[PDB]
Design a protein around this ligand. Structure first.
Ligand SMILES: Cc1ccc2cc1-c1cc(nc(N)n1)Sc1cccc(c1)OCCCCO2
Length: 215
């Protein structure tokens, strides 16, 4: 029988929308840094659950392994980054993925306008948005302890959606699914992914596994 699901559509905060339009509509040469930014957010989320587990060990009931998985899919042109970190509550999601102003937004846009390399984004606290250098649409699935699994999605254009996820349960953590632009398929290649992780994400304190679909 027909199922019904509630959806909430939100507008991005003005400067976040302006930043996303700048990232999408301007040429940048060193786009590979998007992966460093997402792995760095996963590493931070893994530290959060690790430290919380020291006080309340039952916070690991949802999965004891602390790690990052990278899953390129050449059939549907997606690159997925999964972690078993702390995950996001509904408030963490709506607050960190678009509704709240970030102190570094205006400074970062002015710095990009002056010729700064896109690699500077992380320093400004808006590193996630680098996903739009390579992706036309980003889906974020997240699961925090004592809360439901949520799905966030945006193709930019000024809006994002949030819904309770009725899909595949994750025990705990965050999955970022990058629906790559047609000209950015190099980020589905095993060699290219290894190259960029070696260059930019070599001091990550958690194991990372790259899953490669048999050719
Ligand atoms: C997908 C995402 C986008 C933006 C972002 C964090 C994550 C983001 C968030 C998380 N995990 C992953 N992998 N990415 S868990 C989390 C939960 C609450 C607060 C968190 C992180 O960080 C607060 C600092 C700002 C983080 O900004």
């Amino acid at each position: 029988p027909m199922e019904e699901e509630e959806v909430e559509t939100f507008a991005f905060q003005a400067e976040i929308a302006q930043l996303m339009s700048l990232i999408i509509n301007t040429f940048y040469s060193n786009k590979e840094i998007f992966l460093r930014e997402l792995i760095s957010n996963s590493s931070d989320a893994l530290d959060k659950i690790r430290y919380e587990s020291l006080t309340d060990p039952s916070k690991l009931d949802s999965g004891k392994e602390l790690h990052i998985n990278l899953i390129p899919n050449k059939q549907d042109r997606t690159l997925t980054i999964v972690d078993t970190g702390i995950g996001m509550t509904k408030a963490d999601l709506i607050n960190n993925l678009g509704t709240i102003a970030k102190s570094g937004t205006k400074a970062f846009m002015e710095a990009l306008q002056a010729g700064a390399d896109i690699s500077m984004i992380g320093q400004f606290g808006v590193g996630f948005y680098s996903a739009y250098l390579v992706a036309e649409k980003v889906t974020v699935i997240t699961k925090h302890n004592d809360d439901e699994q949520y799905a966030w999605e945006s193709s930019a254009g000024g809006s994002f959606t949030v819904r309770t996820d009725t899909g595949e349960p994750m025990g705990r953590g965050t999955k970022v699914i990058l629906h790559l632009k047609e000209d950015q398929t190099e980020y589905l290649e095993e060699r290219r992914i290894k190259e960029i992780v070696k260059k930019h994400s070599q001091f990550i304190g958690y194991p990372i596994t790259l899953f490669v679909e048999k050719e």
